[PDB]
Enzyme design. Structure first.
Site, short mmCIF file in Angstrom:
data_model
loop_
_atom_site.label_atom_id
_atom_site.label_comp_id
_atom_site.label_asym_id
_atom_site.label_seq_id
_atom_site.Cartn_x
_atom_site.Cartn_y
_atom_site.Cartn_z
N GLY A 5 107.68 -61.83 -39.04
CA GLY A 5 107.47 -60.44 -38.62
C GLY A 5 107.20 -60.18 -37.16
N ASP A 38 113.91 -62.34 -42.69
CA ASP A 38 114.09 -60.88 -42.79
C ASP A 38 113.83 -60.23 -41.46
OD1 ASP A 38 111.28 -61.33 -42.83
OD2 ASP A 38 110.93 -59.69 -44.38
N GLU A 42 110.70 -68.88 -42.86
CA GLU A 42 110.64 -68.30 -44.19
C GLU A 42 110.97 -69.29 -45.30
OE1 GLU A 42 111.82 -66.72 -41.42
OE2 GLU A 42 110.74 -64.79 -41.37
N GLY A 93 104.15 -61.46 -40.76
CA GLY A 93 103.51 -60.50 -41.66
C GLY A 93 102.31 -61.18 -42.33
#
Ligand SMILES: [Cl-]
Ligand SMILES: [Zn+2]
Ligand SMILES: [Zn+2]
Ligand SMILES: [Zn+2]
Ligand SMILES: [Zn+2]
Ligand SMILES: [Zn+2]
Length: 340
Positions: free
Chosen positions: A112, A143, A135, A64
């Site tokens: 992502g 996530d 992360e 992301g």
């Protein structure tokens, strides 16, 4: 610029992530484009399959867009929460999708990028694949349904990937259940052309190969030995005590990561292992992501990446059980999946 290029060719819905100067990092706009096209194509008989690729040469998707999360976390978190709400719904939809969804997880595929590729049903990696859930290095927790995938990997390989945040290969990705098929990089183009012209099964038969040896699979003995510890500190101690270079390297890498993020990551993967549903797992991840927006380490972690993070709490010994439990608190609204 169209940040996602869209076309239909040979009955295949083509989604090409198109921010190559950013290694195709995902914006909220790109997520909503993908989601809307998957919805539009789902009941359209002219579209038999979907194919996700990335522009350029360096990778499908590095993650992301972290700058936007950073700006939101410094503000009131509204864009980050909305982004994650839409992104996690997209991740789940790819996971359920009734038609073949082919993902070309070539080159760099992280965070992502795993979310848009690794829940597909025809997941292709190559000899250049460098896949990771990194992360904890920015004070965040894996996530995009990564905890569902990590908790399903053989042995403790998933914890290793999650706590180190280190990259792994295409062959490793297949071993860990993040991908299905291996195609060398300088056949992706022939492979992609064949999906469009001859279909998935013909393209695979013609271009897929036996993957090479997985170095991660060869490390399973000491990973399973060392990652059974109750706490992250227990795990680090065991890796050090094993007294061998690969374990020591893992310990050294873990020791650079955010203590609170490491702790929440360990708890997340363990809790995810008890959840059958991708949606239920994403609901947990959404609580965790929302909680991380209020943290010191998310801002500090991303800041350091953009500009040697000074984590707070600075040591695992200062992380309490309540500190970890706080990341799993209910939020309002919870992540929901209705609107199909
Ligand atoms: Cl569905
Ligand atoms: Zn190339
Ligand atoms: Zn901004
Ligand atoms: Zn937005
Ligand atoms: Zn659907
Ligand atoms: Zn080619």
């Amino acid at each position: 610029n169209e940040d996602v290029l869209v076309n239909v060719e040979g009955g295949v819905g083509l989604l090409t992530l198109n921010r190559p100067k950013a290694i195709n990092s995902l914006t909220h706009g790109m997520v909503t484009t993908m989601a809307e096209r998957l919805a539009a194509w789902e009941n359209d008989d002219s579209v038999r399959a979907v194919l996700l690729t990335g522009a350029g040469e360096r990778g499908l998707c590095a993650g992301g867009d972290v700058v936007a999360i950073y700006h939101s976390a410094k503000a009131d978190g509204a864009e980050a929460r909305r982004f994650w709400f839409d992104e996690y719904r997209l991740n789940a939809h790819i996971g359920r999708y009734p038609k073949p969804y082919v993902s070309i997880m070539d080159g760099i595929v992280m965070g992502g990028g795993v979310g848009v590729g690794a829940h597909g049903n025809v997941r292709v990696v190559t000899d250049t694949t460098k896949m990771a859930m990194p992360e904890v290095g920015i004070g965040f927790i894996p996530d995009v349904g990564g905890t569902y995938l990590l908790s399903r990997a053989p042995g403790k390989l998933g914890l290793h990937a999650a706590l180190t945040g280190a990259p792994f290969s295409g062959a490793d990705a297949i071993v860990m259940g993040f991908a299905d098929h291996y195609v060398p990089h300088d056949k992706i183009d022939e492979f992609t052309r064949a999906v469009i012209a001859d279909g998935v099964d013909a393209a695979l038969a013609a271009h897929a190969q036996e993957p090479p040896a997985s170095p991660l699979a060869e490390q399973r003995s000491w990973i399973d030995e060392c990652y059974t510890g109750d706490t992250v500190a227990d795990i680090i101690a065991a890796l050090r005590a094993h007294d061998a270079p690969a374990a020591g390297e893992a310990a050294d890498l873990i020791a650079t990561r955010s203590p609170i993020a490491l702790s929440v990551t360990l708890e997340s993967v363990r809790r995810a292992a008890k959840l059958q549903s991708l949606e239920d797992t994403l609901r947990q991840e959404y609580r965790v992501s929302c909680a991380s927006l209020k943290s010191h380490d998310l801002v500090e972690g991303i800041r350091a990446q953009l500009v040697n993070p000074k984590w707070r709490p600075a040591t695992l010994a200062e992380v309490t059980e309540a500190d970890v439990e706080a990341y799993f608190a209910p939020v309002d609204p919870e992540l929901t999946f209705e609107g199909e």
